[PDB]
Amino acid sequence: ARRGALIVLEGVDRAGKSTQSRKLVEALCAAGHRAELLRFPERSTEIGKLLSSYLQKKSDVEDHSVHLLFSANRWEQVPLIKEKLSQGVTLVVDRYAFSGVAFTGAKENFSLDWCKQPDVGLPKPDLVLFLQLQLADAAKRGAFGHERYENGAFQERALRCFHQLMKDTTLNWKMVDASKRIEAVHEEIRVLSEDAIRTATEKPLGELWK
Amino acid sequence: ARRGALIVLEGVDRAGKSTQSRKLVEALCAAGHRAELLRFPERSTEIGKLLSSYLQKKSDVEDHSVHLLFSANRWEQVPLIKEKLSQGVTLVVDRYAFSGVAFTGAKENFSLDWCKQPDVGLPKPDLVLFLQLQLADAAKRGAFGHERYENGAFQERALRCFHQLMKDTTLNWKMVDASKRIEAVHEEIRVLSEDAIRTATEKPLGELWK
Ligand SMILES: Nc1ncnc2c1ncn2[C@@H]1O[C@H](COP(=O)(O)OP(=O)(O)O)[C@@H](O)[C@H]1O
Ligand SMILES: Nc1ncnc2c1ncn2[C@@H]1O[C@H](COP(=O)(O)OP(=O)(O)O)[C@@H](O)[C@H]1O
Ligand SMILES: Cc1cn([C@H]2C[C@H](N=[N+]=[N-])[C@@H](COP(=O)(O)O)O2)c(=O)[nH]c1=O
Ligand SMILES: Cc1cn([C@H]2C[C@H](N=[N+]=[N-])[C@@H](COP(=O)(O)O)O2)c(=O)[nH]c1=O
Ligand SMILES: [Mg+2]
Ligand SMILES: [Mg+2]
Ligand SMILES: [Mg+2]
């Protein structure tokens, strides 16, 4: 039975990860694929609620602790991720380990290596789309939110970490010009995703960063 | 101001970590030291309650997730640990990262290296006492508990991991013959601890596994 593809959406702030993720799943399903949407953090579990309270500033969490919770929040979904992929279901994921590393990695005294370790071993995405957008363009999309990390300076330190992670040639990274309209960005992502489901899947699901 | 020492108690099942830890703190205080007791897991925080529900079998948790929570449960106490040590308070800890690695490391497909990473960077113990006890002797102390991991076969796989961790010469490991009476074991630990508070402290607090 042909496994599903694991597709991740990553990208700068307001670049359209959530919009594009919901649109990709809808369009794959409409074209007869079996596809479902996931996102991280997944706030409905016990850990997810801790992470949600942190991001909304309702609680403060030690930085190493919070990093590990974010990763744990991925590991708790691995049994489901692996089962859905083995059943032929393509999974479109709004943020994954890349955000985990880039966001803690933007903080002082957090090496990229330390930030990567908790996630080593996770299911490896068959495709990692990185939605790029210029600052001037992200502004036309509205004001920063009120949640933690939604600050220009901090966003720019996360972006440098993302660019380090993209030097990683074990991953099938694809850049997406997220400045275009919602529809045009969607068509670019869609075609890339059809291609990943079609080919990328003839190899077994890999393991991230190992 | 002379910093406190960070002293960890590790050891096989029923070897006396908790008894010896409470006795050491009492005796250091009685001899005019400033000393306080900590333990891991620390079940009173939000994470600690998750860990307590897991150990008591009231909930099941994915293995990588549970490993990261156990480490996060240490990181959330680092601000306090560092502040108490800088104030001259010696901290006696009932289990630390060594248990974290040995217990997940006893499970299938968990390399010691992966298990160590979440804890890299923690405050480094000035002294790690390992209470050794033969199986036949641990039995005279009563029956296994009902909690997760309290099984002869699993305990023996954790012990092999502990022996790998003791090959680590960056740590001041001391073996303790925990087969003696409660008092005699206590006198051995006490003398070792006075020595660690006295000398081991003239160097800054280190960082574990780095
Ligand atoms: N290509 C696009 N062009 C214009 N506006 C967009 C585009 N993609 C998303 N938006 C809008 O920008 C805001 C951010 O989109 P969202 O998908 O929530 O981004 P993210 O999840 O990356 O933060 C929303 O108002 C959304 O409608
Ligand atoms: N040296 C010792 N000799 C005999 N019994 C002991 C000794 N140390 C502890 N005990 C008993 O063994 C049991 C386990 O002790 P405990 O300190 O809770 O061990 P741990 O925390 O290592 O599991 C308790 O009943 C305790 O009184
Ligand atoms: C998945 C993940 C997200 N995050 C962050 C990125 C976002 N903060 N900002 N901007 C935040 C919320 O996600 P959304 O933007 O997808 O709603 O969590 C982490 O810090 N670590 C992680 O492992
Ligand atoms: C500190 C720590 C303890 N543990 C385990 C060891 C013990 N299980 N058994 N036996 C358990 C409970 O601790 P006590 O024996 O100290 O009450 O948690 C971990 O699995 N990981 C950790 O990081
Ligand atoms: Mg979003
Ligand atoms: Mg390494
Ligand atoms: Mg105990």
Side-chain angles (χ1 to χ4, degrees), chain A residues 1 3-210, chain B residues 1 3-210:
Chain A
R3 68 168 180 101
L6 179 52
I7 297 182
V8 169
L9 287 75
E10 285 294 6
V12 313
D13 184 51
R14 287 173 288 167
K17 300 176 294 299
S18 300
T19 301
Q20 296 308 330
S21 317
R22 294 185 299 268
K23 291 184 60 77
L24 174 63
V25 173
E26 173 189 33
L28 292 181
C29 293
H33 295 281
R34 284 161 80 219
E36 287 184 43
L37 181 69
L38 298 176
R39 73 322 285 148
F40 292 100
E42 169 50 62
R43 307 179 183 228
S44 64
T45 64
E46 304 165 280
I47 288 159
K49 288 160 191 272
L50 297 181
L51 290 183
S52 187
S53 162
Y54 174 75
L55 295 161
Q56 290 174 14
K57 270 108 143 254
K58 295 184 174 146
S59 71
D60 289 302
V61 180
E62 197 278 340
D63 298 320
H64 301 81
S65 175
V66 95
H67 187 71
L68 302 178
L69 291 175
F70 268 113
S71 171
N73 182 242
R74 289 172 277 287
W75 281 107
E76 71 184 342
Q77 289 308 318
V78 167
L80 171 65
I81 283 174
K82 292 184 174 175
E83 181 182 276
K84 290 278 173 164
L85 298 168
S86 70
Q87 293 171 52
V89 179
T90 284
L91 302 170
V92 171
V93 188
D94 185 348
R95 293 190 191 276
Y96 198 52
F98 314 102
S99 282
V101 166
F103 275 84
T104 294
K107 290 170 181 190
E108 310 282 346
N109 303 325
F110 275 93
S111 72
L112 218 72
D113 177 83
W114 184 90
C115 291
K116 287 163 54 168
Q117 312 302 309
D119 288 320
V120 164
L122 285 175
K124 183 191 186 166
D126 294 301
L127 168 61
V128 189
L129 296 156
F130 190 79
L131 281 56
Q132 300 190 281
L133 180 62
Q134 285 307 63
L135 154 96
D137 280 324
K140 304 195 212 155
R141 280 169 205 200
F144 280 111
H146 59 270
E147 280 199 330
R148 212 189 280 287
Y149 303 156
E150 290 176 293
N151 141 295
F154 191 85
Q155 292 275 322
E156 148 71 20
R157 305 169 60 85
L159 182 70
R160 303 291 71 233
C161 297
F162 276 117
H163 282 124
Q164 297 307 287
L165 295 183
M166 301 177 207
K167 284 156 52 182
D168 196 320
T169 206
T170 60
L171 291 155
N172 174 35
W173 288 93
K174 293 291 189 181
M175 302 299 97
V176 177
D177 176 4
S179 70
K180 300 151 153 196
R181 59 250 215 51
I182 287 172
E183 286 299 333
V185 174
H186 166 65
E187 180 66 4
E188 227 92 286
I189 288 178
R190 190 184 66 73
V191 160
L192 292 171
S193 305
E194 289 270 358
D195 190 62
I197 292 160
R198 177 184 178 254
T199 301
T201 48
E202 60 190 84
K203 239 189 97 173
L205 180 60
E207 292 188 276
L208 176 62
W209 293 330
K210 69 177 278 185
Chain B
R3 68 168 180 101
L6 179 52
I7 297 182
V8 169
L9 287 75
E10 285 294 6
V12 313
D13 184 51
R14 287 173 288 167
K17 300 176 294 299
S18 300
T19 301
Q20 296 308 330
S21 317
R22 294 185 299 268
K23 291 184 60 77
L24 174 63
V25 173
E26 173 189 33
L28 292 181
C29 293
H33 295 281
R34 284 161 80 219
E36 287 184 43
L37 181 69
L38 298 176
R39 73 322 285 148
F40 292 100
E42 169 50 62
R43 307 179 183 228
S44 64
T45 64
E46 304 165 280
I47 288 159
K49 288 160 191 272
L50 297 181
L51 290 183
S52 187
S53 162
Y54 174 75
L55 295 161
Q56 290 174 14
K57 270 108 143 254
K58 295 184 174 146
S59 71
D60 289 302
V61 180
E62 197 278 340
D63 298 320
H64 301 81
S65 175
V66 95
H67 187 71
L68 302 178
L69 291 175
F70 268 113
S71 171
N73 182 242
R74 289 172 277 287
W75 281 107
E76 71 184 342
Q77 289 308 318
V78 167
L80 171 65
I81 283 174
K82 292 184 174 175
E83 181 182 276
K84 290 278 173 164
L85 298 168
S86 70
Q87 293 171 52
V89 179
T90 284
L91 302 170
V92 171
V93 188
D94 185 348
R95 293 190 191 276
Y96 198 52
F98 314 102
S99 282
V101 166
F103 275 84
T104 294
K107 290 170 181 190
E108 310 282 346
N109 303 325
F110 275 93
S111 72
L112 218 72
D113 177 83
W114 184 90
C115 291
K116 287 163 54 168
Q117 312 302 309
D119 288 320
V120 164
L122 285 175
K124 183 191 186 166
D126 294 301
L127 168 61
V128 189
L129 296 156
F130 190 79
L131 281 56
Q132 300 190 281
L133 180 62
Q134 285 307 63
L135 154 96
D137 280 324
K140 304 195 212 155
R141 280 169 205 200
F144 280 111
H146 59 270
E147 280 199 330
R148 212 189 280 287
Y149 303 156
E150 290 176 293
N151 141 295
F154 191 85
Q155 292 275 322
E156 148 71 20
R157 305 169 60 85
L159 182 70
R160 303 291 71 233
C161 297
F162 276 117
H163 282 124
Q164 297 307 287
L165 295 183
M166 301 177 207
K167 284 156 52 182
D168 196 320
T169 206
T170 60
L171 291 155
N172 174 35
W173 288 93
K174 293 291 189 181
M175 302 299 97
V176 177
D177 176 4
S179 70
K180 300 151 153 196
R181 59 250 215 51
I182 287 172
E183 286 299 333
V185 174
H186 166 65
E187 180 66 4
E188 227 92 286
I189 288 178
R190 190 184 66 73
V191 160
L192 292 171
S193 305
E194 289 270 358
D195 190 62
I197 292 160
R198 177 184 178 254
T199 301
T201 48
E202 60 190 84
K203 239 189 97 173
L205 180 60
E207 292 188 276
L208 176 62
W209 293 330
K210 69 177 278 185

